[PDB]
Amino acid sequence: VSKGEELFTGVVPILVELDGDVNGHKFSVRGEGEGDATNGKLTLKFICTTGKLPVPWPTLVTTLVLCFARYPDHMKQHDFFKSAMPEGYVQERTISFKDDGYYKTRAEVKFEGDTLVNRIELKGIDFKEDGNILGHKLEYNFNSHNAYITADKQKNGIKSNFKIRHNVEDGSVQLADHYQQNTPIGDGPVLLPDNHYLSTQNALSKDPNEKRDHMVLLEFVTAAGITLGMDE
Known part of the structure; x- marks a missing residue:
């Protein structure tokens, strides 16, 4: 069985590219x-290093490290993400x-030295140039x-689909339908969980002394949905 969860008992530096x-x-x-x-x-701060971000920062939140979710002690056996560490997993999505x-993303989440790295390639296709995305019509x-x-036993990993509801500045809602697949990188043993969910909250802010286009992000992710029976 995997030891990877021991890499997360303290505070771990993160790099996202x-x-x-x-x-x-x-x-x-x-x-x-x-x-x-x-x-x-x-807790992360993101910089658009190429100048102006041509999409709204909220549309990249899900793309920009689920190995940091808090799995309750009685659900530690369902934590695929840490079980794959340090070698890591590939995380692929299409976000419609x-x-x-739609976005298509492919990321590798893995340790490089002491640092948990999330390295992503993203392609966006068929957007309206004055729609809610390219038109920057979403609230922050x-x-x-x-x-x-x-x-996803037939791929030795997990999958997820979920709908993100972005608030539009006029009061409407822009749906972002997510389809996700994770598969380990190494050959070691991985935990295939029972059905459950991750509960996420996000607070987005700005750094006053930052002139670049950026996002300061505080995020909490907690696993739930698995019945704790009295057998403990």
């Missing part, structure tokens, strides 16, 4: 901070924005949300 291309609008994001899986807590374009926030996790 994203290369993106949405309708030919190219961009890069670099994030740094730390993760505290004991509390399910992430309703009445608009991110609602709390529960994402269901199921095992």
